[PDB]
């Protein structure tokens, strides 16, 4: 399972 | 033994010719088990191994949504990074991301990782301590400040240390049988005259797992030998690996050479002789 949300924008 | 789970992401921009190509794949050790390809009609996270298929609709829905959100973030980042570097809009560019965790035989955390690249080069990475970032250049420095400011390390550590391992354990157990485990190399030697001078001896190692292996040649043992050929380890396509080492020997005098095979699956190192 992947994380619930992605990292905030770079 | 110990295992790992990794997710791989690749977003490639094709300016003037559509939106970034997005490809994501999940790994348990060397086995691909899920995938997403922005070109696929389904637009869903798809199974790739028999043991992940039993997962219900709740699983696939949530994976699809979360993987799709990743691609959107990459899309935005591509624009942002091009901007950082002052690159032209016509150029194609790549973002690659890898994260995951390792666990021991007991299923406990060993380490977690997360690293990102831009055009095949280190961009930014989570340090071993899972608490600090390493920026590869002035541009990544910008991203670093953002990520620190947003406390992104904490929630990532919560995943790598928490959720990640918990699911790896589930996967390992679910597909323990089918998952590739220790397989001893099947070895043999071949002979190929180039002239009658002059012949090639090739030492084969087949159907072995894991990929880690050692093939070495000797003349008039115990005398180690270079001046030999050795192909890179290659996947057989069934979960196992292949490799061979070769040496050019005088039509003699073939019988004075020996091949030596080392693999964790063998009760003892093997010695082959023509």
């Amino acid at each position: 399972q992947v994380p619930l949300r992605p990292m905030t924008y770079k | 033994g110990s295992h790992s789970m990794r997710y791989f992401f690749t977003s490639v921009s094709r300016p003037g010719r559509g939106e970034p190509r997005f490809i994501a794949v999940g790994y348990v050790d060397d086995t691909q088990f899920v995938r997403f390809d922005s070109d696929a009609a389904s637009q869903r996270m798809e199974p790739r191994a028999p043991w992940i298929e039993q997962e219900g609709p709740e699983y696939w829905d949530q994976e699809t949504r979360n993987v799709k959100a990743q691609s959107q973030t990459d899309r935005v980042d591509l624009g942002t990074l091009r901007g950082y570097y002052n690159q032209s809009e016509a150029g194609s560019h790549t973002i690659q991301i890898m994260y995951g965790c390792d666990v021991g035989s007991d299923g406990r955390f060993l380490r977690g990782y997360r690293q990102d690249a831009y055009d095949g080069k280190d961009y930014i990475a989570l340090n071993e301590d899972l608490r600090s970032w390493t920026a590869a250049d002035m541009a990544a420095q910008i991203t670093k400040r953002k990520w620190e400011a947003a406390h992104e390390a904490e929630q990532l550590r919560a995943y790598l240390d928490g959720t990640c391992v918990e699911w790896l354990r589930r996967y390992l157990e679910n597909g323990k049988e089918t998952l590739q485990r220790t397989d001893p190399p099947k070895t043999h030697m071949t002979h190929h005259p180039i002239s009658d001078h002059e012949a090639t001896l090739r030492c084969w190692a087949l159907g072995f797992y894991p990929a880690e292996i050692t093939l070495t040649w000797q003349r008039d043992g115990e005398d180690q030998t270079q001046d030999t050929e050795l192909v890179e380890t290659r996947p057989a396509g069934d979960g196992t690996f292949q490799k061979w080492a070769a040496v050019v020997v005088p039509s003699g005098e073939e019988q004075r050479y020996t091949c030596h095979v080392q693999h964790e699956g063998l009760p003892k190192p093997l010695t082959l002789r023509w």
């Binding site: - | 790739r48 690659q96 055009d119 095949g120 996947p235």
Partner: protein, 99 residues
């Protein structure tokens, strides 16, 4: 900034004439990811060729495995054609059951 792909052509099992098998073309170490890989039977494209999904190594270089069913004969010639931005032209690697 760019890297040309290594290429290996081989069978999943030891080649035996008239015996069903699998023909592989392993491409690795390349960048960027856009790559063209065909398996050939006597110069003609082989249809229904599958491959693993794009992945990469620690050094950020990509790798892929292409594969299709095939029954080797003594005369039939099999090969792998690979094209990539770093390639002046498509390189063809023949299948050799001894390598």
């Amino acid at each position: 900034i760019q890297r040309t792909p290594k290429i290996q052509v081989y069978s999943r099992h030891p080649a035996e004439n008239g015996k069903s098998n699998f023909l592989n073309c392993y491409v690795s170490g390349f960048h960027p990811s856009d790559i063209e890989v065909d398996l050939l039977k006597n110069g003609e494209r082989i249809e229904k060729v599958e491959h693993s999904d794009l992945s990469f190594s620690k050094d950020w270089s990509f790798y892929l495995l292409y594969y299709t069913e095939f029954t080797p004969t003594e005369k039939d010639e099999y090969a792998c054609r690979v094209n990539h931005v770093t390639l002046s032209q498509p390189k063809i690697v023949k299948w050799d059951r001894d390598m």
